[PDB]
Structure 1
C-alpha cells in the first residue's frame, strides 16, 4: 500500500493535466467570449 503511492500518483497527474487544460478552456469560455461581443 506504500507502493500504491506510485500507483495512484500516475492516475492523479494524468487526471489533473487534463483537468487543468479543460479548466484553461473554461477560462477561455469567459475571457475570449468577453471581448467577442461588439459595442
Structure 2
C-alpha cells in the first residue's frame, strides 16, 4: 500500500506538469490580454 501511494503520487506529478503546461497557457492568455490592453490605451491616449 505504501508503494502504491508512492507510485500514485508519481503519476500525480505527471499530471502536475500536465497542469503546469496549462499554466503556461494561462500566462499566454495573460500576455495577449496585456497586448490588447496596450493597444487600447495607445488608441485612447495617443492620437496615432
Place the TM-score, normalised by the shorter chain, in its bin: 0.5 to 0.7
Instruction: Give the number of the structure whose alpha-carbon radius of gyration is greater.
Output: 2
Structure 1 stretches of 5 or more lacking a match?
none
Spell out structure 1 runs of 4+ moving beyond 3 A: none
Per the normalisation by structure 2, the TM-score is: 0.53
Structure 2 stretches of 5 or more lacking a match?
1-11
Task: Return the structure number with greater helix share.
Answer: 2
Q: CA RMSD in A?
A: 2.5
Across the two proteins, how many residue pairs are aligned to each other? Answer: 37
